[PDB]
Design a protein around this ligand. Sequence first.
Ligand SMILES: CC(C)(C)NC(=O)[C@@H](c1c(C(=O)O)[nH]c2cc(Cl)ccc12)N(C=O)Cc1ccc(OCc2ccc(Cl)cc2)cc1
Length: 94
Amino acid sequence: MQIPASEQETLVRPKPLLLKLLKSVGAQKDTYTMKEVLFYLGQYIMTKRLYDEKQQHIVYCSNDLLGDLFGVPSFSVKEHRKIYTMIYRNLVVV
Ligand SMILES: CC(C)(C)NC(=O)[C@@H](c1c(C(=O)O)[nH]c2cc(Cl)ccc12)N(C=O)Cc1ccc(OCc2ccc(Cl)cc2)cc1
């Protein structure tokens, strides 16, 4: 896998906007493992149908809160380094 699995176990504290986003799809806590944050971001992208229907590795967010948080108009789910950095922009480590 692109990023070692041990990275998903890191305990993190989402900043206010990201925390609001996570809770809007049913997250229940103030702190998460990175694996949990990824899961809930996945539910958000699904629920708002932001992925390209035919090219499902592309997520569009130029006009969505997700784009505000990530700082991009769209991204590929295949490029994990960028996902890591985009998420960490919105976190502090516990
Ligand atoms: C677009 C769709 C169909 C709604 N979901 C997925 O594609 C996807 C997924 C999930 C998921 O929990 O399945 N969560 C995602 C979050 C983002 Cl930001 C983008 C994709 C996912 N699940 C993929 O296999 C895709 C995925 C892609 C990258 C990924 O992790 C990168 C990463 C690894 C480790 C760290 Cl520490 C940080 C980031 C996790 C899941």
